């Protein structure tokens, strides 16, 4: 209906509660392995944020996997920063991590993060 | 870190993509039964919105159930309106459904919805 009312803070409150579930390891259903590092997460949040995870978890065989191994060229800290962004909307972008974050966002198909990284790099040149 | 940047639309874009997954029945992991009606959903979204579902899916036995039967006094249309609110932030509140929506929100422990229902009822008296 076009007669709905909307609770402004709802989407951010949902995301905050999803991140609290992740911190407590509640209903996490996949482990993402990035070289020597493992990250537990919820497949639906990964799919909702990342074009790569959407393609992975909509595949009829990969949707059932409990472990996903990323390309060995992916930096674990870059992945950690992007996973935190997925669950919080906040990106810890710094001079020391921007190239790793941008490369990881290109691989994960997260265009808005790729865009802000390109803008910060261009401003320094 | 306190040096993060934030993407304003991220939380609403995540919620919009979760609702698209629900519409396509992608990675839904529970059926909620309300009398003769069945609703497929994602346990994590239900937990992130509802105090009742949080208690249910954090229980060591109930967390494993693929079907949850609600109290027979719960109205299916009221539940449908609240499930849509969980996935969209939009509440289809109307004169003809407000009492059912309020009773369902009290049962699901969704205090913000209970609050706006109380305010709309008080304004009509």
């Amino acid at each position: 209906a076009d007669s709905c009312i909307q609770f402004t803070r709802h989407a951010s409150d949902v995301l905050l509660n999803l991140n609290r579930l992740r911190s407590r390891d509640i209903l996490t259903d996949v482990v993402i392995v990035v070289s020597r590092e493992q990250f537990r997460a919820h497949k639906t949040v990964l799919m909702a944020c990342s074009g790569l995870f959407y393609s992975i978890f909509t595949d009829q065989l990969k949707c059932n996997l409990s472990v996903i191994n990323l390309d060995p060229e992916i930096n674990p800290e870059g992945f950690c920063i992007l996973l935190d962004f997925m669950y919080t909307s906040r990106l810890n972008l710094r001079e020391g991590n921007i190239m790793a974050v941008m490369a990881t966002a290109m691989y994960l198909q997260m265009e808005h993060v790729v865009d802000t990284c390109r803008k910060f790099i261009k401003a320094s040149e | 870190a306190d040096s993060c940047i934030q993407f304003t639309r991220h939380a609403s874009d995540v919620l919009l993509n979760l609702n698209r997954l629900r519409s396509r029945d992608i990675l839904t992991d529970v059926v909620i039964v309300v009398s003769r009606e069945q609703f497929r959903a994602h346990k994590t979204v239900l937990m992130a919105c509802s105090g009742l579902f949080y208690s249910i899916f954090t229980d060591q036995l109930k967390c494993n159930l693929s079907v949850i039967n609600l109290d027979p006094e719960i109205n299916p249309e009221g539940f449908c309106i609240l499930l849509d609110f969980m996935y969209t932030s939009r509440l289809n509140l109307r004169e003809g459904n407000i009492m059912a929506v309020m009773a369902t929100a009290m049962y699901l422990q969704m205090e913000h919805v209970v609050d706006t229902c109380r305010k709309f009822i008080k304004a009509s008296e």
Binding site: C4, I5, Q6, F7, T8 | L91, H112
Partner: peptide, 5 residues
């Protein structure tokens, strides 16, 4: 909060 979207 609540608003008219």
């Amino acid at each position: 909060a609540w608003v008219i979207p």
